[PDB]
């Protein structure tokens, strides 16, 4: 089809049971940031409390779509993106969900 740019969306993951959006806390790492697994990518903040979120595995930090305060942060909404090197985090550098809005959440 089309091989351009190849990372990994990270869907807001519940972290709690009646999880209906979170806060990203903190992102404990940054854009270029190596991550491990384990590694805390960020911590959410739920009814329960701040929760860390940790990797799943190695890569680095492809882009920070929600930041840090970011509240009302529904479940499943991609919090950030991942890839397998660093030479792609530039390309998703300048990464952007379709390429439409006036100001603020508009989702075309």
């Given at each position: 089809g089309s091989s351009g740019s190849s990372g990994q969306k990270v869907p807001?993951?519940?972290?709690?049971?009646?999880?209906?959006a979170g806060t990203i806390?903190?992102?404990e790492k940054k854009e270029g940031d190596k991550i491990n697994?384990?590694?805390?990518?960020a911590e959410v903040e739920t009814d329960k409390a701040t929760v860390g979120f940790e990797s799943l595995?190695?890569?680095?930090?492809?882009?920070?779509?929600v930041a840090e305060g970011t509240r009302d942060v529904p479940i499943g909404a991609i919090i950030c993106i991942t890839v397998g090197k660093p030479e792609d985090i530039e390309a998703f550098k300048?990464?952007?969900?379709?390429?439409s809005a006036a100001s603020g959440p508009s989702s075309g």
């Open positions: 807001l993951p519940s972290l709690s049971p009646t999880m209906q806390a903190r992102w697994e384990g590694d805390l990518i595995e190695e890569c680095y930090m492809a882009k920070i779509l300048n990464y952007t969900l379709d390429s």
